[PDB]
């Protein structure tokens, strides 16, 4: 049985636009918990993490809200490690992607051998020294990679951090807006990725075949899927802060997750960057939330071909 | 030469929403006959079947309008068998999909060896005992399969029925909203299908290769294509009663049909579920009808690469 | 380094709808030059060609504006041949596609061995004798093919013309609206093409593999890409005179060009048929121009996976 641990993380200081901290809210009221139970899922809601208000959090060089970001992630890492010890797949309904730092960190504590699939239009691997915006939702990966420790300076709020994954344990899918420094890091550290160009070339089918074989070839190991809503095309998930045209299809989104589900190795899930305040219409918000909800259910079993219980219909 | 027999079937009691019985009307006024003739097609319009008004048709258990549905289908089966004996491909411009029962039945009478391709977002294989809605447009296949006779009760209006096809003579394409009982029947009877997951995985090209090889491997045999308009994505065919996101692409729709046409074995065609009254705008109606018209022309020869006569241009 | 030569060609008499002669304008103000320089490109703007006003230009049979069309193309051929001798890839920001005649002609002068990739929803290979509209933006290819000289009559304004490419040096991609005579010419001259049916069947990946292998198999040779904006789906490039549904995807558009760029053999580029006056909304115009701009940048290096300089980030 698929046992899940719901972690609400209403946080937004990893990026400038407010409203992403409403994510857990709109997703829950969308009926996410009820829908998960509607399936053969065991679900325990750990609630919305109450995030510390850090008033004195001036920039560190160019990095914005470092103490708020580092604290919220440190708080999440603890809860995630908690649900994992409870033998449940952690489902972090987030705000911005900077939370990936705490999410993946807490996961690795209980499962140091985890492999990561990062669905996103961006690589979010900028360092405090390479970021040009200073927004931490575009730097989470830089704090988690071991190869990169020595290049990430001491940023207030992240002293608790310890790179938990190496360049060979992560695969990107959906890339279409990568900075030059990020690209240099990709090729330099030899990180495996499938940008939109590879998806167009090979097909999402082969893309998934190759990604799983890549991460699970040597052996089976826990999988952490970090799903940034902007990885999908804006025609599907318009209410998000950093949209980029030419994204992953609604179908491709479901394919990716249906395939992950079928491995039986999913142990961590992040559904990030849904910002209801950024929809141009009420339907744009509804369209984003519904899509985010559908991708979530696919991670936990919902199959387009249908499902049925071990009973004689 | 492609000889066609147009059968207008303005029927809607297979489902709750009225307006689908206008289908033949909007399609004809869209210039369907003229366009078919514009090609190298021989076309005979058998007119719109005048459908009996059955006032006393109370539910059978949960099944709605059983006598109206069974009568309209029995009426269609007779006409279809008529055009087939006239050596013409039957083209049933319908209302709801429950008409598939009469359409496929009348077809098999003249060609008992027929194979069926069912393009739809749904499997429409619920039985009177498994249906939760009672709407017969989601049960046509259950009445036609031989393996299932023994599970389909005696429903008023369908005593004339006799399962004409077995589980190994039908292939589904486009599935994305299948009930648990329907899924159980799929896996239990070993029915061949390509849900959206398979289309995403293999590509519509391989999907078609496999479907035709599946049905025509052993030998060439007449093909009956039952095309439910909701099999295509709602961005293409929005004016339909049961839309489901993540559907077949406009291009994929044309690919499927262009491939069927090229076999030279098409003998029966159903273009169902177009409901002009369900469009949110006049353009949504026009968009649905135009797409339905385009898929029809592709079944009878229109090729995207172009066409030309056996003359020196 | 990718050295480019910008040629503005504000011309519209190859088709009935005015406004396409604004193309160079909207593209330049869209920041095209600046964006190209933003990359590792050397860019020289040869300006907007001042096109002769030919008042006395009555139809030739059915052919409209023959002297205006032939003159503007003759003028472009000279400039294109100029930038090519300057060792720069010619980038013709055009109006209508009839300019392809002058563009490809001037290119071949300096590089007679050139191969052509024609991205378009149409084959634009009608002859003055096969065209039913008389609009020259649908006849450019007929004037350029050697095999066809003997069938193209003496049309006022094109005496300067000399077919420069044979049927075996051109590949079409995106076809979905081809006339019967054009189709007859396709099959008769054995021209290589990938209509939307082939793109759906094989995938844009294989399509590109096959196209380049086809044209560059025997040997490496300069490539001329003639990109008609209507080759892409109208949901991407709506502001164009002859749109056709079921077109090339935004992603496929970028894939095609990213692949061409990677050959290192691009020498001529046409970005045609963008008509800002045909957008139903200001955003439809912006959407068309932005897409046309993105396809242009991809031809010159912009990669979705990212880019970086030969420096240590
Ligand atoms: Ni992103
Ligand atoms: Ni992200
Ligand atoms: Ni359906
Ligand atoms: Ni149906
Ligand atoms: Ni065109
Ligand atoms: Ni063209």
Q: What would the DSSP string read from start to end of chain B?
A: -EEEEEEE----TTSS-TTGGGHHHHHHTTTHHHHHHTTTEEEEEEEE------S----BTTB-SHHHHHHHHHHHHHHHHHHHHTT-EEEEE-SSGGGHHHHHHHHHHH-TT-EEEEE-SS-----TTT-SS--GGG-HHHHHBGGGTTTS---TT-TT----B-GGGEEEEEE----HHHHHHHHHTT-EEEEHHHHHHH-HHHHHHHHHHHHHSS----EEEEEEGGGB-TTT--SSSS--SS-B-HHHHHHHHHHHHHHT-EEEEEEE---GGG-SSHHHHHHHHHHHHHHHHHHTT--TT----SS--
d(CA B255, CA C198): 9
Pairing type for strands A2-8 and A89-93 reads: parallel
Tokens of C118: 């024609």
Distance C216 CA to ligand 6 centre (A): 23
C146: nearest Cα among C169, C123, C126, C128: C169
Smallest CA–CA distance from A312 into chain B, residue? B184
B298: nearest Cα among B247, B236, B233, B253: B253
Which residues in chain B have Cβ-Cβ distances shorter than 8 Å to C182? 306
Establish whether A224 is an annotated binding residue: no
Which residues in chain A have Cβ-Cβ distances shorter than 8 Å to B185? 313
- Please list the alpha-helical segments (H only) found in chain A: 23-28, 32-37, 66-85, 100-110, 140-144, 180-188, 196-202, 204-216, 250-263, 282-299
Smallest CA–CA distance from A131 into chain C, residue? C313
d(CA B139, CA B123): 8
Are B308 and C196 a contacting pair at CB < 8 A? no
Dihedral angle computed from the Cα positions of residues C15, C88, C146 and C99, in that order, rounded to the nearest 10 degrees: 10
B278: nearest Cα among B96, B132, B103, B131: B96
Interface of A with B (CB under 8 A): 203-205, 250-252, 254-255, 258, 303-309, 311-313
Among the options B21, B57, B74, B124, which is catalytic?
Answer: B124
Distance A127 CA to ligand 2 centre (A): 14
Query: Any catalytic annotation for residue B120?
Result: yes
d(CA A11, CA A49): 9
Distance C97 CA to ligand 6 centre (A): 5
The H or E element spanning position C236 is none
- Partner residue opposite C251 with nearest CB, options A179, A182, A246: A246
Are A175 and C204 a contacting pair at CB < 8 A? no
Interface of B with A (CB under 8 A): 123, 130, 175-187, 193, 195-203, 245-246
Query: Any catalytic annotation for residue C273?
Result: yes
Technique behind the model = X-ray
CB C272 within 8 A of CB C229: yes
First to last CA, chain C: 21
d(CA A157, CA A30): 33
Query: Any catalytic annotation for residue A228?
Result: yes
Tokens of A113: 């051998």
B223: nearest Cα among B87, B297, B118, B142: B118
The H or E element spanning position A3 is strand A2-8
Q: In the block, which residue shows the tokens 């985890």?
A: A114
Q: In the block, which residue shows the tokens 């031809």?
A: C299
Q: Which CATH number fits domain C1-313: 3.20.20.10, 3.40.630.30, 1.10.1060.10, 3.40.800.10?
A: 3.40.800.10
Distance (Å) of CA B236 to CA A305, B232, B239, B245: 21, 7, 9, 11
Q: In the block, which residue shows the tokens 């207008």?
A: B8
Smallest CA–CA distance from B309 into chain C, residue? C180
Smallest CA–CA distance from B295 into chain C, residue? C246
DSSP SS3 for A259: helix
Among the options C48, C120, C169, C258, which is catalytic?
Answer: C120
Tokens of A101: 């730092």
Dihedral angle computed from the Cα positions of residues C7, C11, C14 and C18, in that order, rounded to the nearest 10 degrees: 140
- Partner residue opposite B175 with nearest CB, options A304, A307, A313: A304
Q: In what order do the strands lie in the sheet with A266-272?
A: A41-48, A2-8, A89-93, A266-272, A223-228, A115-119, A170-175, A192-195
Which residues in chain C have Cβ-Cβ distances shorter than 8 Å to A176? 304
Query: Any catalytic annotation for residue C228?
Result: yes
CB B139 within 8 A of CB B193: no
Q: Choose, out of A252, A293, A304, the residue to mutate when testing the contact with B (most B CBs < 10 Å).
A: A304
Interface of A with C (CB under 8 A): 123, 130, 175-187, 193, 195-203, 245-246
Among the options A124, A169, A182, A258, which is catalytic?
Answer: A124
Which residue positions of C form the known binding site for substrate? Answer: 122-126, 133-135, 179, 242, 273
Residues 6+ positions from A194 with CB-CB distance below 8 Å: A171, A172, A173, A174, A175, A202, A207, A210, A211
For chains B and C, what is the number of CB pairs under 8 angstroms?
65
Tokens of B284: 């949504």
CB B289 within 8 A of CB B277: no
Among the options A48, A74, A111, A137, which is catalytic?
Answer: A137
Number of neighbouring beta carbons within 10 Å of residue A1: 7
| Cα–chain center distance at B237 | 15
Q: Which ligand is nearest to the CA of B177?
A: 3
Give the distance from residue A198's alpha carbon to the nearest chain C alpha carbon, in angstroms.
Answer: 9
DSSP SS3 for C212: helix
d(CA B296, CA B300): 7
d(CA B305, CA C199): 11
SS (H, E, C) A149-188: CCCCCCCCCCCCCCCCECHHHEEEEEECCCCHHHHHHHHH
Are C308 and A187 a contacting pair at CB < 8 A? yes
Give the distance from residue C312's alpha carbon to the nearest chain A alpha carbon, in angstroms.
Answer: 8
Which residues in chain A have Cβ-Cβ distances shorter than 8 Å to B246? 250-251, 254, 304
d(CA C200, CA A238): 27
Establish whether A179 is an annotated binding residue: yes
Distance A53 CA to ligand 2 centre (A): 23
CB A19 within 8 A of CB A277: yes
Give the distance from residue A150's alpha carbon to the nearest chain C alpha carbon, in angstroms.
Answer: 14
Residues 6+ positions from B111 with CB-CB distance below 8 Å: B84, B221, B222, B267
CB C93 within 8 A of CB C271: yes
* Radius of gyration for chain C, computed over Cα atoms and rounded to the nearest angstrom: 18
d(CA C10, CA C27): 11
The domain limits of chain B are: 1-313
Are C306 and A123 a contacting pair at CB < 8 A? yes
Query: Any catalytic annotation for residue B124?
Result: yes
d(CA C227, CA B232): 29
| Cα–chain center distance at B313 | 38
Distance C215 CA to ligand 6 centre (A): 20
d(CA C124, CA C83): 26
Residues 6+ positions from B126 with CB-CB distance below 8 Å: B132, B138, B139, B142, B179, B181, B182
Number of neighbouring beta carbons within 10 Å of residue C120: 29
């Amino acid at each position: 049985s698929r046992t899940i641990g719901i972690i609400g993380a209403p946080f937004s200081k990893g990026q400038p636009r407010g409203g992403v901290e409403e994510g857990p809210t709109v997703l829950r009221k969308a009926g996410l918990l009820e829908k998960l139970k509607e399936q053969e899922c065991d679900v325990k809601d750990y609630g919305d993490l109450p995030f510390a208000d850090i008033p004195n959090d001036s920039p560190f060089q160019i990095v914005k809200n470092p103490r708020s970001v580092g604290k919220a992630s440190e708080q999440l890492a603890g809860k995630v490690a908690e649900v994992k010890k409870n033998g449940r797949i952690s489902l972090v309904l987030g705000g911005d992607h900077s939370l990936a730092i705490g999410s993946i960190s807490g996961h690795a504590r209980v499962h140091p051998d985890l492999g990561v699939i990062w669905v996103d239009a961006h690589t979010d691997i900028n360092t405090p020294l390479t970021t040009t915006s200073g927004n931490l939702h575009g730097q989470p990966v830089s704090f988690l990679l071991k190869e990169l420790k020595g290049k990430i300076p001491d940023v207030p709020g992240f002293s608790w951090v310890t790179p938990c994954i190496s360049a060979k344990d992560i695969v990107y899918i959906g890339l279409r807006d990568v900075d030059p420094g990020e690209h240099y890091i990709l090729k330099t550290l030899g990180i495996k990725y499938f940008s939109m160009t590879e998806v167009d070339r090979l097909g999402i089918g082969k893309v998934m075949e190759e990604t799983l074989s890549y991460l699970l070839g040597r052996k089976k190991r826990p999988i952490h899927l970090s799903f940034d809503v902007d990885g999908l095309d804006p025609s599907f998930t318009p209410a998000t802060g950093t949209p980029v045209v030419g994204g992953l299809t609604y179908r491709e989104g479901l394919y990716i997750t249906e395939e992950i589900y079928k491995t039986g190795l999913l142990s961590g899930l992040d559904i990030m960057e849904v910002n209801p305040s950024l929809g141009k219409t009420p339907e744009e918000v509804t369209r984003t939330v519904n899509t985010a909800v559908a991708i979530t259910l696919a991670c936990f079993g919902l199959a387009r071909e249908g499902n049925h219980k071990p009973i004689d219909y």
